[PDB]
Each structure stands twice: as C-alpha cells, then as structure tokens.
Design an enzyme around this catalytic site. Structure first.
Site, PDB file in Angstrom:
ATOM      1  N   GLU A 181      -8.574  68.959  77.711  1.00 53.60           N
ATOM      2  CA  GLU A 181      -9.585  68.509  76.632  1.00 53.60           C
ATOM      3  C   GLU A 181     -10.806  68.215  77.514  1.00 53.60           C
ATOM      4  O   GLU A 181     -11.965  68.580  77.121  1.00 53.60           O
ATOM      5  CB  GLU A 181      -9.274  67.243  75.831  1.00 53.60           C
ATOM      6  CG  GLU A 181      -8.318  67.785  74.861  1.00 53.60           C
ATOM      7  CD  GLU A 181      -7.204  66.670  74.379  1.00 53.60           C
ATOM      8  OE1 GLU A 181      -7.408  65.574  74.529  1.00 53.60           O
ATOM      9  OE2 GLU A 181      -6.289  67.276  73.583  1.00 53.60           O
ATOM     10  N   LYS A 223      -4.605  59.584  74.073  1.00 55.03           N
ATOM     11  CA  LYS A 223      -5.943  60.092  73.844  1.00 55.03           C
ATOM     12  C   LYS A 223      -6.784  59.210  73.009  1.00 55.03           C
ATOM     13  O   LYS A 223      -6.963  58.037  73.235  1.00 55.03           O
ATOM     14  CB  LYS A 223      -5.784  61.571  72.943  1.00 55.03           C
ATOM     15  CG  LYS A 223      -4.716  62.308  73.673  1.00 55.03           C
ATOM     16  CD  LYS A 223      -4.938  63.811  73.288  1.00 55.03           C
ATOM     17  CE  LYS A 223      -3.658  64.709  74.060  1.00 55.03           C
ATOM     18  NZ  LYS A 223      -3.630  66.168  73.378  1.00 55.03           N
ATOM     19  N   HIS A 244      -7.186  66.643  82.610  1.00 52.89           N
ATOM     20  CA  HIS A 244      -7.002  66.853  81.328  1.00 52.89           C
ATOM     21  C   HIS A 244      -7.559  68.196  80.612  1.00 52.89           C
ATOM     22  O   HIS A 244      -8.886  68.263  80.941  1.00 52.89           O
ATOM     23  CB  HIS A 244      -6.859  65.975  80.295  1.00 52.89           C
ATOM     24  CG  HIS A 244      -5.855  66.196  78.929  1.00 52.89           C
ATOM     25  ND1 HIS A 244      -6.295  66.676  77.941  1.00 52.89           N
ATOM     26  CD2 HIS A 244      -4.590  65.882  78.607  1.00 52.89           C
ATOM     27  CE1 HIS A 244      -5.437  66.744  76.959  1.00 52.89           C
ATOM     28  NE2 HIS A 244      -4.269  66.084  77.619  1.00 52.89           N
ATOM     29  N   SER A 266       2.766  69.786  72.599  1.00 50.65           N
ATOM     30  CA  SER A 266       3.729  69.649  71.467  1.00 50.65           C
ATOM     31  C   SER A 266       5.204  69.128  71.986  1.00 50.65           C
ATOM     32  O   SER A 266       5.973  69.682  71.312  1.00 50.65           O
ATOM     33  CB  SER A 266       3.649  70.860  70.841  1.00 50.65           C
ATOM     34  OG  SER A 266       2.371  71.074  70.309  1.00 50.65           O
ATOM     35  N   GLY A 317      -1.314  70.170  70.675  1.00 48.54           N
ATOM     36  CA  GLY A 317      -1.811  69.709  69.321  1.00 48.54           C
ATOM     37  C   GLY A 317      -1.628  70.824  68.079  1.00 48.54           C
ATOM     38  O   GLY A 317      -2.212  70.680  67.263  1.00 48.54           O
ATOM     39  N   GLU A 334       0.307  72.030  81.014  1.00 54.24           N
ATOM     40  CA  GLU A 334       0.268  71.869  79.748  1.00 54.24           C
ATOM     41  C   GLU A 334      -0.633  73.155  79.144  1.00 54.24           C
ATOM     42  O   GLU A 334      -2.069  73.296  79.292  1.00 54.24           O
ATOM     43  CB  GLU A 334      -0.655  70.558  78.935  1.00 54.24           C
ATOM     44  CG  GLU A 334       0.115  69.249  79.315  1.00 54.24           C
ATOM     45  CD  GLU A 334      -0.602  68.246  78.612  1.00 54.24           C
ATOM     46  OE1 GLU A 334      -1.837  68.030  78.416  1.00 54.24           O
ATOM     47  OE2 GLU A 334       0.270  67.350  78.285  1.00 54.24           O
ATOM     48  N   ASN A 362      -0.009  60.137  76.648  1.00 55.38           N
ATOM     49  CA  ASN A 362      -1.288  59.972  76.724  1.00 55.38           C
ATOM     50  C   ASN A 362      -1.681  59.833  75.086  1.00 55.38           C
ATOM     51  O   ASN A 362      -1.606  60.475  74.083  1.00 55.38           O
ATOM     52  CB  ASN A 362      -1.837  61.270  76.778  1.00 55.38           C
ATOM     53  CG  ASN A 362      -3.289  61.522  77.124  1.00 55.38           C
ATOM     54  OD1 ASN A 362      -4.058  60.488  76.585  1.00 55.38           O
ATOM     55  ND2 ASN A 362      -3.853  62.723  77.243  1.00 55.38           N
TER      56      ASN A 362
END
Lengths: 256, 256
Positions: free
Chosen positions: A97, A12, A95, A215, A175, A169, A10
C-alpha cells in the site's frame, strides 16, 4: 534446517480505542505457544493503547511503518527511536500500500529497513508484484528487485539479515479475496529462497522466515502452512477478527 | 473586525514518552488565557500519552498529519475518524516537510484538508515558498497556488473555510534560524488576505486566522505579533522548549 513460524496481523488503518482494547484483550486471552512468533500491528495512534491492553507474555505489538531518519524535522513521521522508546521490537516496512499507492520507492523501503535493523529491530519486509507485472511474466524480476534494493543497503551482512522476515504479498491478493494457490505461493517462495542462497548466504537461506500475505484467513491458511517454504502469514483483514486466533492455532499445528 | 489569536506547537518527529509527559505537564501548568487558542501537535505515537498528560482546560492536542481516506487498507496512515475517536479537534495539513521532502502534492494536501473539515475538524493548512521560488519572484504565485488547490476542493464554501487556519511558513525559514522580517511576513499575509477576499469572501477575509511559522521564537515573536495580519504562530523547534510558554504570553499581550 527449519524456522520459527511467524504470524503477523496488520490492522492497517482500522480501529477505535474501544476496539483496540477489546480485540487486543481477546488475542491476549488466547493460548499462544512459545514456539511461534505472533505480532500485531495497530495504527500508530493506537500503539500505546494496544501495549497497555496486551497482557500476553507471547504476543508482541509492532508498528506499520517507520521513517528513514532519526528524530528531527519530519512532520508526520515516526522514528525508530520513538518505537524503541515505547518498547517495540517489530516494524512492517515496504507494505505494498505504501509502495504502490503512496509512492514509497524500493530504495526508500530499503533505507527504512536498514535503519531499523541497525538499531536492533525486527523488520517485516514486504515484497510483491501487481497483476500487470505477473501477466507480463515479471513476477520474480519485480520481487527480486525489491529485495536487491535492501541487499544494496545491507549487502551480505550477517545479522542485518538475521532479523528480517520477508513477507511476500501478491498485490492482486491484497483485500481482493483472491488468495494465491499453495502452488503459486510456494513457487515464489522457492524463488526468493534461491535468490537469498545465491546472493546473500546458502546457510542463511535455511533460516530466514518468508511469510505469505494476501487474503490469508482461517479457511485457507492450513494448505499454505503445509508448503515447505511458507513460514507463516502476514494477515490483513482477518487480523481484525476472532479468526486471527484460529490462524495462530493452525500455524502451530502445521509447522511445529 | 478581528480574530482570535492562535498559537500552535508542532513537535515534529521529536519526543519520548517521558518527554511528552513532562513537557505537556509544563505547558498545562502555564496560565493559558481563554482569549487565545493554544494547540500542540505531538508525534502520532505520542498522542494518547499527551492527552493523558494534558490537565489544562485550554490547551488542545492536535495531530501532525492525516490521510485523505477513511478507515481501510492504508498501511501506515491515520484517518480523521481515528483522530475524532481520540477526541482531537485539530490537525496540521500540508506542512512543507510533507510537501517538499515527502512529495505530498497540492491536490493531496487539499483533499486531506477537505475531508477533515467536512468531518468537523479545524485544519492548520500550511503554505510557503522555497528560497529558489522567492528568488524567481514567484512567492505569491506559489502560495496562492497551494491555496487555490484547497479552494478547488472547497470553493467558496462557508464554514468549510470557517475552521481553516492558514499557516504561512517560508521554507527558507524552517529550522534555519532565519526568521522572516515583520515586513516580509506581513507582505505575504496581506497578499493572502487579499486573495481570500477576492476569491472566497470579503467578510470571510476579516475572520480567517493567518499565522506565521519558520524560526518563530520567544525573542522575535512580539514584533511579528504586532503586524496587523499575523494572527499568531506555528512554532517548531521552540515548541519543545519552555520558551513556548513565553510565546503564549507575548501573543496574548500583543493581540488581546
């Protein structure tokens, strides 16, 4: 019985036209085996550039998001129809985010996924808990709730689930450079597979891919790939780097 | 003193690769005068296709949305940096579909606009009230609130406002076939221009473009274009049709 391993990158909100051209060429130049699914998801404005740069017979281009309506008056949104017209098979839905930062609800993620699946796409459906939720010992409750929302839209439907790849995730691993330990990740994946067997289908639980993200990189992915229930990776930052290819190789060696 | 007229075509969530190629070619084949700004906003996945198809020296390609952060971990979002790397100058911010359907807040729209303007883009900043709000006699209060949110992020800044084009689109006129009467539209545009003169700059109010959107088409745009404070149009459905070119011609004839 076992699963075709899956690795997704991904990108992003990263990339320029020149980077997409150069990086997609680099990935396409790698010897990707036929035994593993490898998919990269550039930003929407870069999809056509990535498709043109992709000379691989194995690598597939995916989208990072899609809306839950068809074509129409949805300014700023992309439809499944648009993605299929461009020849895409894969899309990331839910996702963290989008869930946690942009307010995408469990039901909205589920509806996006259902629409894409019904049209024949493969959906990488993301779930995961925050550090707060894990501290409150609600890890499984949260992840299961996100999946039950999809279940509500798809139920026990066969082959709606066939083209779902579940991506776990943990939000605290995204991140942050804090990967879940193999023990922590496997524990959740076992829980998700038990849920699938109980609420969808026991035979189906044997076949659905559940991948880990957060990560994941070239240094830690072998130990994760050795876990029986981790079928591969959803890779964020490392997918923008040459180590993405190292991860493809590690996944192949460990799970095929 | 007067304004360069502006016409924008928002394709929204419509189009296929073949349509974008054919329709952008059709628009580019039209004789567009140098005296009017003409901008079309395809869906994000189609931007590069539209840029390649655009052989016009006048027509510009715009984006329908942009995020309020730079490049980074924003799955599904596009940054200003990405748009500028593709050579784009224009972006639509705060469209009512994003405000009312997708939950984009006044502050979020304002922050997106500020970021784009600071980087040198021209922002088509959309405001407008719902039928409920107009029934409650809150039309100006609502529109002004949306603008004051931008004002809070830009204040009285000069030339942050220079590249703003305000688009007034009553929500009840969007896709409903119910255009505002010239009287109704002009009344709001007068109110917005009075607000700008009072809260930003009197001289600036003379120069800022305020365009009308909401069921604007080839049949009704002349009467709207004759209103002193309506500097052009934000066109939705009609922008997907050959009548978009008729509107360009009408706007030129009426305001240049």
């Amino acid at each position: 019985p076992a699963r075709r391993p899956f690795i997704g990158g991904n990108f992003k909100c990263n990339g320029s036209l020149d980077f997409i051209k150069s990086h997609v060429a680099a990935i396409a130049a790698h010897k990707i085996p036929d035994s593993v699914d490898v998919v990269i998801a550039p930003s929407a404005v870069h999809l056509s550039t990535a498709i043109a740069a992709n000379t691989s017979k194995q690598l597939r281009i995916a989208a990072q998001n899609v809306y839950l309506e068809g074509n129409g008056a949805w300014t700023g949104e992309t439809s499944v129809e648009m993605l299929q017209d461009m020849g895409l098979k894969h899309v990331i839905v839910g996702h963290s985010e989008r869930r946690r930062i942009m307010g995408e609800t469990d039901e909205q993620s589920a509806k996006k996924a259902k629409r894409a699946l019904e049209k024949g796409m493969t959906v990488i459906f993301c779930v995961g808990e925050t550090l707060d939720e894990r501290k409150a010992n609600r890890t499984m409750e949260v992840n299961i709730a996100q999946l039950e929302a999809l279940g509500k839209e798809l139920g026990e439907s066969k082959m709606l689930w066939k083209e779902v790849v579940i991506a776990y995730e943990p939000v605290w691993s995204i991140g942050t450079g804090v990967v879940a330990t193999p023990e922590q990740a496997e524990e959740v994946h076992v829980g998700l597979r038990k849920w699938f067997a109980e609420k969808v289908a026991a035979e189906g639980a044997q076949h659905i891919r559940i991948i880990y993200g957060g990560s994941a990189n070239g240094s830690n992915c072998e130990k994760l790939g050795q876990c029986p229930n981790i079928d591969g990776f959803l890779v964020g930052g490392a997918s923008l780097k040459p180590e993405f290819m190292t991860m493809i190789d590690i996944l192949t060696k460990t799970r095929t």
